Amino acid sequence: MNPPPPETSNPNKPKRQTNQLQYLLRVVLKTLWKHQFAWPFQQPVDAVKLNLPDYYKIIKTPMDMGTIKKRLENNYYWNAQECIQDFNTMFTNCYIYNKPGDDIVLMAEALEKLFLQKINELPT
Numbered sequence: 001m002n003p004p005p006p007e008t009s010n011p012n013k014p015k016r017q018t019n020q021l022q023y024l025l026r027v028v029l030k031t032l033w034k035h036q037f038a039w040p041f042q043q044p045v046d047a048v049k050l051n052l053p054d055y056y057k058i059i060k061t062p063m064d065m066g067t068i069k070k071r072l073e074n075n076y077y078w079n080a081q082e083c084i085q086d087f088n089t090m091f092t093n094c095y096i097y098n099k100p101g102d103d104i105v106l107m108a109e110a111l112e113k114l115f116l117q118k119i120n121e122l123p124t
């Protein structure tokens with residue numbers, strides 16, 4: 001079964017807009033999104049559709065780029081580091097659930113390298 005997806009808004013959490021967060025949406029996320037290996041990460045893992053019935057028995061902090069994108073669009077984050085942590089959670093979940101060498105892991109590894117390339121330098 002699938003749990004509810006992660007929240008993309010929270011009225012009691014303070015919002016913020018920063019040059020770095022704008023950049024994470026306009027450049028980092030929106031560029032990764034177009035990568036040929038982006039598709040598995042563009043929405044929450046669907047344990048039913050993908051036939052991964054144990055996914056959420058194993059992964060307790062789900063994250064995906066669809067969620068991140070919505071969060072950025074909503075100014076959900078306080079700062080860039082909070083957003084970067086979501087990306088890292090997404091990649092880490094993939095390495096936890098799957099094994100080295102798996103096609104999905106090769107896709108995550110590629111995206112993570114591109115992600116690190118693009119956040120190496122952020123605006124000030």
Ligand SMILES: CN1Cc2ccccc2NC1=O
Pocket residue numbers: 040041045050094097098104
């Ligand atoms: C995050 N995904 C996405 C996915 C899509 C299709 C088949 C397998 C997976 N495994 C994952 O861990």
